[PDB]
Design a binder for this molecule. Structure first.
Ligand code: ZN
Length: 320
């Protein structure tokens, strides 16, 4: 009289927990919010075809809470639901291989995600959460739906929202092992003298204000804390890449002088990202579309450079 089937529940798709579900009640009535491959099945009853399948549930007991933290590195109770909500969409996107890199076909305003995804495959970055490590590798094999859904969930962004590549990279870098990265800056005020700062982690690899790594080495003009104009320059850099960003402006990209870059067309409220990469020549990846040219000048907002160890030769005459 009581009909049942056996399913597995999980929060990480690795640790599977056998469950016996009553076929007269919905999954929601028994588990709470329940997902089958991203699809919200909270309000449907178990079907005979569901036997043996794996369902995601929210981490609502001590065992699941530990498993979710160990896999995702966040205790945010909303995280799994936001991941599943995004995955229901990203599993329908297409992930073509374009010039040896996994891209995303245009959909749901995902151009900024495609540009970030392409960049991540070209810089040396190790993710700390197993969820991101595993999904990054699957994305490299062309199965990028989980990686894209995780990026959205870690960024607190939903499918369909417009986005910013620099912002997206900054949030992902929070989840990368960058604690060997180091940046030493000097701000030289003609009155106050020299003021040196050491940055670590995400702050050691990102700079907002110029696209040019060379210009950052030579010095950029900024207001000193006293209100006068000062000069800031890079003293020492220890990292495998650096990201230089600025609001989009016409910028010449020379083959072999950079790793990749973000082109931004349109305006600040309604823009389009494309990805420029330097290989044997210059390539532009626009979703599934590929173009090439020997030279490039256009509206750039991020440039990524290779690095290992840099020490300035600048040695100011000033004081302090
Ligand atoms: Zn000053």
């Amino acid at each position: 009289e009581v009909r049942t089937i056996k399913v597995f529940t999980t929060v990480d798709n690795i640790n599977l927990h056998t469950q016996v579900v009553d076929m007269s009640m919905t999954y929601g009535q028994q588990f709470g919010p329940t997902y089958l491959d991203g699809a919200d099945v909270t309000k449907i009853k178990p079907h005979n075809s569901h036997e043996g399948k794996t369902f995601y549930v929210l981490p609502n007991d001590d065992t699941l809470r530990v498993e979710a933290f160990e896999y995702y590195h966040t205790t945010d109770p909303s995280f799994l639901g936001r991941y599943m909500s995004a995955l229901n969409h990203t599993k329908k996107w297409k992930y073509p291989q374009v010039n040896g890199l996994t891209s995303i076909k245009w959909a749901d305003n995902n151009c900024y995600l495609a540009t970030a995804l392409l960049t991540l495959q070209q810089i040396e970055l190790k993710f700390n959460p197993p969820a991101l490590q595993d999904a990054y590798y699957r994305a490299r094999a062309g199965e990028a739906a989980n990686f894209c859904a995780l990026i959205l969930a870690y960024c607190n962004k939903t499918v369909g929202e417009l986005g910013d590549v620099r912002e997206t990279m900054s949030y992902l870098f929070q989840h990368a092992n960058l604690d060997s990265c180091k940046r030493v800056l000097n701000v030289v005020c003609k009155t106050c003298g020299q003021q040196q700062t050491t940055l670590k982690g995400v702050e050691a690899v990102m700079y907002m204000g110029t696209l040019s790594y060379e210009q950052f080495k030579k010095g950029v003009q900024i207001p000193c804390t006293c209100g006068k104009q000062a000069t800031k320059y890079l003293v020492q850099q220890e990292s495998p890449f650096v990201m230089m960003s600025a609001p989009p402006a016409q910028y010449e990209l020379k083959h072999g002088t950079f790793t990749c870059a973000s082109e931004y067309t349109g305006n600040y409220q309604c823009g389009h990202y494309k990805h420029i990469t330097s290989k044997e020549t210059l390539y532009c990846i626009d979703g599934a579309l590929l173009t090439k040219s020997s030279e490039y000048k256009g509206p750039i907002t991020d440039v990524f450079y290779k690095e290992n160890s840099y020490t300035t030769t600048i040695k100011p005459l000033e004081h302090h």
